[PDB]
Write a protein that binds this DNA or RNA. Structure first.
Ligand code: SF4
Ligand code: ZN
Lengths: 677, 118
DNA sequence: AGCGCAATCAGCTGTGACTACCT
DNA sequence: AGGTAGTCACAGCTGATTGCGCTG
């Protein structure tokens, strides 16, 4: 229906609008009228996207001049496809409610592997070689030699798109990635090239974070698209981590071995301009000098260039030219493929980063390995320390950057973690006919001994027995699915080993099946599949995993999957490896951020992010427990999102295992009754 | 440009201006005696200041976070400028005599409480 | 051994009835 | 010979002190 905002009417596919959605629309309209950025926090993954798109379309219709381009950067490809299909549903609703079409174009962007039609590159699973093969098949030299019609195998989609697809536009009709591929294959055009041509003449477009956070591709994909545009980062609770990883590179023995292997081939090709031919040869030994040095750590972000200009005595000026040399010398050398060549490009990227970015970074060398620390492994990584650098080139190029996710409880730390000027300070807590979640914090066990996962008490037998008892008698009350997140893989395996040693793991087995998530991707996928198939029937299952793992955020536990989420201790990141402590010191001496406050913020952010995936949809319900007394302290509860705070009553903040089980039983019994709409 | 209150020489950026909005250059920064930094608990105990008096009474008082030398896992110390703390105490309590009477009556009340507990 | 959340004491007050002193 | 303000018991609140915990 038509929702009447204070100064506009907006069509919405769903007749009924929840108060949270209405308040969200009010706040977003206020921000758009304020011409400023903002941060938002909503508890529903679904229903936020439709409201966002509806308000965006209404604002564009009312003010075509104020807003011209929309960006909906998300985390992965499933989010892209679901937002595209939701936009398609919205457009279908608008067509069926209005009767006339509109000249609005919406496309989804992804990598070369996602959008390609050649059968010679699809079967392979090399993401770093598909771009190189695509460049080799079609490039400037390919276009130049196509005039003579050279008899050689090459891609021909571009050779038809440049002569037929650069004239006919697509004013109307939003196209999904599969639709783009179908159009490209029926018209003999490359989907990527037609997307590149049609982004200029487009209304909305969605892609991943890496196309804006990484400077090496943001300029190519967004240079003069729109001076005044709206960008939104949905599910951006970990925006700082990806921003840090944007300017983070790693070096090891394999990388330098590959570089020394391929430099001989490069020299052989060259001997068949001179400013870099001799420049590239002696760069390897400077970094291999650290390989032979048996030292713990060396830190010198400003003095790294000074040290480089002593052993080899090279000026700082030529370092910045690597970026412009990459696009020039390589295309003249006619590289056959990017295989066995990416480390050379990453070395140039590292050199450019250290030459240009040296104010808020640090160089760390880590000669440590898991289970084999000191054999041969000096690991050099240019770890980023400030999250503002990856977010600067978007705040100054846009007007209403919005950070929204399901876990953004502290709105006073994000504006200081990254340079930001919020004007919203807005949070929304969902309301339903009944409370769909039962958050509670379990402290001491039945023996009145705290189950805190403190480092000095990790090896304690009493706390391990209490954790096992909690998981056992909890598994008898919540049916068809329990998700348990541990602090780390080492703690998880040490706890399950102790459970196996005692006669307690058998009692858990006879209630629900035990599934352990490991680092292997195929093993994790098959374990998830069998966990789902066990949850489908009445057998029940337990999913044991780690809070900081690829399975914590890779999947969503929709209703009847994972009715209970258990947090075994506060998930604290490893303070070792001398990487976290550098960031802690940088935030201490730069943003005046307390180290304890930042650690608690990260721990609670991860805990809330991994515990809020059990509530997807109004009808969905789930049980949330926190098996640590440290959660009971106010400084950690206050970091939980507002949609969980009001449901966490003061009655259950330190209750034992038995009373937690009783509360879970009452909640589950009272949540099985029919409800209304 | 910012004019120093001590020498008057124009400067663009200075440590005191950056950290406490104090218009004083680094050359005149007498951080040893005049601009000494004290911990938050020590300032609260000496000047009988509260959190509201430090963060909500205009103007707000900034602070510098530094690592604790004694223990890495322990709380980082919050350091406030002594001049700003003195000015805030004088503005809140009116005069130094009021603060000197307040500390005496507080210790007298502490003695009264301990003898009552006994 | 500096912060910060939480346990603790002081001062005032409500509810109800019992009790000492004197015009 | 009669009646009202202290007073005790038991509870509440808010306003400070002050004392134990605080990261793999
Ligand atoms: S030009 Fe397009 S179709 Fe051809 S190889 Fe590259 S991505 Fe694939
Ligand atoms: Zn001066």
């Amino acid at each position: 229906m038509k929702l009447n905002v204070d100064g506009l009417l907006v069509y919405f596919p769903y007749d009924y609008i929840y108060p949270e959605q209405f308040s969200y629309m009010r706040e977003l309209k206020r921000t758009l009228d304020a011409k400023g950025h903002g941060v938002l926090e909503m508890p529903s993954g679904t229903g936020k996207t439709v409201s966002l798109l509806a308000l965006i379309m209404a604002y564009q219709r009312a003010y075509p001049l104020e807003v011209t381009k929309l960006i909906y950067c998300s985390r992965t490809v499933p989010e892209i496809e679901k937002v595209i299909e939701e936009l398609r549903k919205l457009l279908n609703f608008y067509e069926k409610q209005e009767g006339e079409k509109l000249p609005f174009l919406g496309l989804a962007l992804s990598s070369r592997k996602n959008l390609c039609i050649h059968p010679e590159v699809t079967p392979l699973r090399f993401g770093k070689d598909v771009d190189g093969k695509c460049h080799s098949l079609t490039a400037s030299y390919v276009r130049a030699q196509y005039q003579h019609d050279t008899s050689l195998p090459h891609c021909r989609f571009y050779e038809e798109f440049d002569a037929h697809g650069r004239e006919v536009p697509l004013p109307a009709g939003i196209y999904n990635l599969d639709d783009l591929k179908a159009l490209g294959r029926r018209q003999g055009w490359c989907p990527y090239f037609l997307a590149r041509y049609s982004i200029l003449h487009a209304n909305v477009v969605v892609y991943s974070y890496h196309y804006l956070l990484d400077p090496k591709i943001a300029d190519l994909v967004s240079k003069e698209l729109a001076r005044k545009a709206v960008v939104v980062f949905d599910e951006a609770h970990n925006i700082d981590n990806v921003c840090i990883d944007s300017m983070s590179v790693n070096l090891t023995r394999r990388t330098l071995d590959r570089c020394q292997g391929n430099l001989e081939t490069l020299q052989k090709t060259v001997l068949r301009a001179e400013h870099f031919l001799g420049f590239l040869r002696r760069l390897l030994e400077y970094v291999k000098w650290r390989l032979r040095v048996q030292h713990v750590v060396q830190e010198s972000p400003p003095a790294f260039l000074s040290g480089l200009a002593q052993r080899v005595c090279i000026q700082r000026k030529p370092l910045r030219f690597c970026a412009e040399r990459l696009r020039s010398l390589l295309h003249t050398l006619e590289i056959t493929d990017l295989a066995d060549f990416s480390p050379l490009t990453l070395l140039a990227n590292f050199a450019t980063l250290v030459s240009t970015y040296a104010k808020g970074f640090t160089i760390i060398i880590e000669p440590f390995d898991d289970r084999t620390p000191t054999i041969a492994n000096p690991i050099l990584h240019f770890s980023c320390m400030d999250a503002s650098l990856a977010i600067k080139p978007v705040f100054e190029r846009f007007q209403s950057v919005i950070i929204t996710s399901g876990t953004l409880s502290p709105l006073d730390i994000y504006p200081k973690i990254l340079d930001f000027h919020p004007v919203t300070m807005a949070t929304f807590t969902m309301t339903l006919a009944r409370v769909c979640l039962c958050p509670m914090i379990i402290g001491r066990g039945n023996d009145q001994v705290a189950i805190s996962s403190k480092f000095e008490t990790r090896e304690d037998i009493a706390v391990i027995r209490n954790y096992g008892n909690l998981l056992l008698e909890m598994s008898a009350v919540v049916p068809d699915g329990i998700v348990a997140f541990f602090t780390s893989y080492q703690y998880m395996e040490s706890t399950v080993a102790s459970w196996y040693e005692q006669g307690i793991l058998e009692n858990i087995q006879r209630n629900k099946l035990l599934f352990i998530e490991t680092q292997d991707g195929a093993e994790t996928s098959v374990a998830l599949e069998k966990y789902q198939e066990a949850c489908e029937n009445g057998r029940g299952a337990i999913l044991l995993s780690v809070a900081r793992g690829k399975v914590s955020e890779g999947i969503d536990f929709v209703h009847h999957y994972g009715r209970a989420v258990i947090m075994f201790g506060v998930p604290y990141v490893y303070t070792q490896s001398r990487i976290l402590k550098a960031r802690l010191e940088y935030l201490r001496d730069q943003f005046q951020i307390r180290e304890n406050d930042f650690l608690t913020f990260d721990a609670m952010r991860h805990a809330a992010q991994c515990v809020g995936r059990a509530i997807r949809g109004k009808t969905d319900y789930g049980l949330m427990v926190f098996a640590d007394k440290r959660f009971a302290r106010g400084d950690k509860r206050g970091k939980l999102p507002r949609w969980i705070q009001e449901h966490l009553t003061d009655a259950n903040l330190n209750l034992t295992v038995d009373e937690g089980v009783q509360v879970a039983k009452y909640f589950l019994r009272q949540m099985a009754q029919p409800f209304h709409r | 440009y910012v004019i120093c209150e001590e020498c008057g020489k124009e400067f663009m950026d200075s440590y005191l201006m950056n950290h406490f909005d104090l218009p004083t250059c680094d050359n005149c920064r007498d951080a040893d005696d005049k601009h000494k930094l004290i911990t938050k608990t020590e300032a609260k105990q000496e000047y009988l200041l509260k959190d509201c008096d430090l963060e909500k009474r205009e103007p707000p008082l900034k602070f510098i976070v530094k690592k604790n030398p004694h223990h890495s896992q322990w709380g980082d110390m919050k350091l406030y400028l002594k001049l700003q703390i003195v000015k805030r105490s004088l503005e809140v309590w009116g005069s130094q005599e009021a603060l000197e009477e307040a500390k005496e009556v507080r210790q007298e009340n502490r003695e009264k409480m301990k003898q009552k507990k006994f």
